[PDB]
Amino acid sequence: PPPILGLGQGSGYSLYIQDRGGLGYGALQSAVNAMSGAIMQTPGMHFPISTYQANVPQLDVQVDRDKAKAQGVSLTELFGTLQTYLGSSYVNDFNQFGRTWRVMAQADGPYRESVEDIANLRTRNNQGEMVPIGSMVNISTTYGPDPVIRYNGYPAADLIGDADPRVLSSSQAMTHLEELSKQILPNGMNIEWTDLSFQQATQGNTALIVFPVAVLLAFLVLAALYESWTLPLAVILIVP
Amino acid sequence: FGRTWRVMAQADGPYRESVEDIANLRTRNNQGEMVPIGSMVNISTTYG
Amino acid sequence: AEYPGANPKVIAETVATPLEEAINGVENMMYMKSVAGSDGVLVTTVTFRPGTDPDQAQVQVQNRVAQAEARLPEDVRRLGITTQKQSPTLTLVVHLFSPNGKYDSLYMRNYATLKVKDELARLPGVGQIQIFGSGEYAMRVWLDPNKVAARGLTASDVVTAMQEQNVQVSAGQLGAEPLPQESDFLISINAQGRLHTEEEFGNIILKTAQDGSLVRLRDVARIEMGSGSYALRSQLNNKDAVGIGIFQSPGANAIDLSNAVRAKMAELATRFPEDMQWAAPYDPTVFV
Amino acid sequence: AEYPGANPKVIAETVATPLEEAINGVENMMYMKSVAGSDGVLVTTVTFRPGTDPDQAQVQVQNRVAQAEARLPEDVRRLGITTQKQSPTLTLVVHL
Amino acid sequence: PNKVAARGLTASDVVTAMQEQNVQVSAGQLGAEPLPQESDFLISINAQ
Amino acid sequence: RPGTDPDQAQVQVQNRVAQAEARLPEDVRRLGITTQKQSPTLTLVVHL
Amino acid sequence: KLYLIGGVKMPEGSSLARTDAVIRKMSEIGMNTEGVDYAVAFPGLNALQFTNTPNTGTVFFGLKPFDQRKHTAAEINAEINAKIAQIQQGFGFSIL
Ligand SMILES: CCCCCCCCCCCCO[C@@H]1O[C@H](CO)[C@@H](O[C@H]2O[C@H](CO)[C@@H](O)[C@H](O)[C@H]2O)[C@H](O)[C@H]1O
Ligand SMILES: CCCCCCCCCCCCO[C@@H]1O[C@H](CO)[C@@H](O[C@H]2O[C@H](CO)[C@@H](O)[C@H](O)[C@H]2O)[C@H](O)[C@H]1O
């Protein structure tokens, strides 16, 4: 586990690849695959891990609105049957046990298990009869991500990896992976840092002024005690 | 473009330039007939 | 607040008046004013005693507008009403402009919205950026009333057709609980019903003719993606432009911040289309 | 936010984008992310600069969300968005 | 309620009638955009 | 407690009612919940 | 302050196109003026309220730095003002 709760891994990197042009989810998945390969073949860091998976299958139900008007079934009744039966509908609240709980209406489990189930739910037409909706819908298969991830308002994918403080410190592994990001890069897609990395990527490093002023103060009070601008050094040079 | 925008519905400019253009807009009565609104309204010049 | 197509009179009567009845008495308030124009926009400025916490003032004002929103007109609150503290000290005004004429103020303002606005507001020291010019993109369906009435249709009918036929919807999943045995697969269902282009909107079906042919929206209207506001133009050197007003947050380094925004604009320089450039017509940090 | 029955894409496009649009511009926000799941749930995390006041951050974010609510789909509005500050100070976990 | 019922009317009927006959309305303006030829005047329209 | 900043208390109570709104009946959440710092002290009374 | 504030009020009931014409004319007047680097134009902007009214417009004349100018901003103001007082279409002004 991590040393602390709330930042990430230990030493290492957290990164986000984002698409600013609309390259699509397949392009993002190919980008993350090529990257993770590159990070792996870099000797120190191992295979990075992500939650992005664009190869989740799903079903697309397109509607023939022309055939819908031809058959006399309203488009909203079609979408309503889809909604209530397959996606559940929030009805209202009820009070029980002294608390308030949701009421949910949905088709029972074994009536929404197959594409024939999608075709088999029925809505009403202008002639008042009950008609199956499969005649007006075209269910196909497609591959997309689950969950959908956005970073800073653009579609994105996360990439957090293990470190190698005995090989490549995070500070220059950061610019290494920046060189890889320029390497495996489509125009309109970029990378941005997060968690500790963002800090290291954007810190107005102040240690480079605290260390001087500290040794200056030490030398100065030593001079005061020693009545010499030359004796204090005889101590400040013995610490290394 | 990755953002969300409104879709608006209004008469095109050249159909809302005159008072008679207002009086000419039509709607549906209780017998299905298309009637212009000018018969049921008064349109007056004023200042504000 | 916004009330599209409303007279200043009724904006004052039914939007400004109830709001004002709500915000009055807010803590540390010196005075408030309400300006209601014929562009359908109400702006209410509440000025507080000096030394008042701006963030605290903002939360109190939005508390009172939240109490007020119930009695506003439906279409006013459907667009939302935004409460925000003002950053008074302007540090730089930039302009995107098109010297030859390829781009109009609409395109450049929305390019500002899409590409430079968000990456300027996240710079170290800004307090508020403001856009001046044209308006945000909007799918304008310009109806012809005569053609609409010819097909026996009313404006309400057209609006209800656009509402019924331009919707997302949640198609659910295949193989989700409850089930008498464990399922093997989980498959989400997509049933997209949202239109994305002008032609799809023009393809909306309104009615069926005695012909039996489908009456469509483009039969009675011109469809375009134009502007949501035709109320303010922006030109730099008589070429079409959009003005960005940058306001720093108190405690910042104005010189450093102006240098930072200028360098950022030079970074976005690489990604501009041709015939669109930028300028800084006014820099108020030079004084200090 | 909850959009019961919605797939990740519709949630991202019709809930996450308008909310992110209404949140962007809140002061001292250093970054933010949105996660849309097949369970119909959107979790948007806005992380602020260190030393920020989490209560002011929460109230400002919740105010922007409340003003964006009207442009959200009806059932999402009816279920209600919730803003809350996330705490890292886990002290004990108890199981029944 | 005795008179309302004597006219075959319900409390919902009268309530909705009051809802529908005391309402503000927006009515745009004459000479507004978009126009193929630039307009000279912009005349706001008030409906009450 | 005495000496507590009423403004900070107001903001915190407000944040927590905001987080609790989704566990309340829809009829309540619809009407909105108000949170104002207030002392029950009638400081004076003016009679007309 | 390295800029001048000019504007126009047109007859009540005018359209934004007429204001646009007048504003473009005063803009080009400012350009043909020496020392005015820029003519930032917002036709439709009311300078007093920063609201949008159809018969008013604003234009800021962004002045060149003094080391490249040879006229004091008050003198540019007087010259531009004498130039735009010739516009009969409406009431135009330029102030410090
Ligand atoms: C035997 C029982 C043990 C119970 C253990 C419970 C603690 C387990 C903690 C899981 C790992 C801790 O590691 C922590 O992971 C969380 C969750 O992703 C990360 O958290 C990240 O995502 C969360 C989710 O929105 C954000 O709120 C947070 O701001 C961000 O940093 C932390 O950056 C990382 O430090
Ligand atoms: C030269 C630019 C900088 C000028 C300095 C500003 C100081 C003037 C007093 C402060 C008042 C600013 O008041 C400002 O009003 C303008 C009106 O266009 C609003 O600006 C608006 O412009 C466009 C077009 O109308 C809208 O589509 C947009 O949503 C909004 O940004 C600002 O949101 C508000 O902050």
Numbering used by the authors:
A (entry chain B): 673 to 912
B (entry chain A): 769 to 816
C (entry chain A): 49 to 336
D (entry chain B): 49 to 144
E (entry chain C): 193 to 240
F (entry chain C): 97 to 144
G (entry chain A): 577 to 672
What does the paper say about this structure?
Resistance nodulation and cell division (RND) efflux pumps are secondary active antiporters that are ubiquitous across all domains of life. As part of tripartite multidrug efflux systems in Gram-negative bacteria, they span the entire cell envelope and export a broad variety of structurally and chemically unrelated toxic substrates. During drug efflux, AcrB undergoes a functional rotation where each of the three protomers sequentially cycles through the conformational states loose (L), tight (T) and open (O). Substrates can enter the PD through several channels and bind to the access pocket (AP) in the L state and the deep binding pocket (DBP) in the T state.
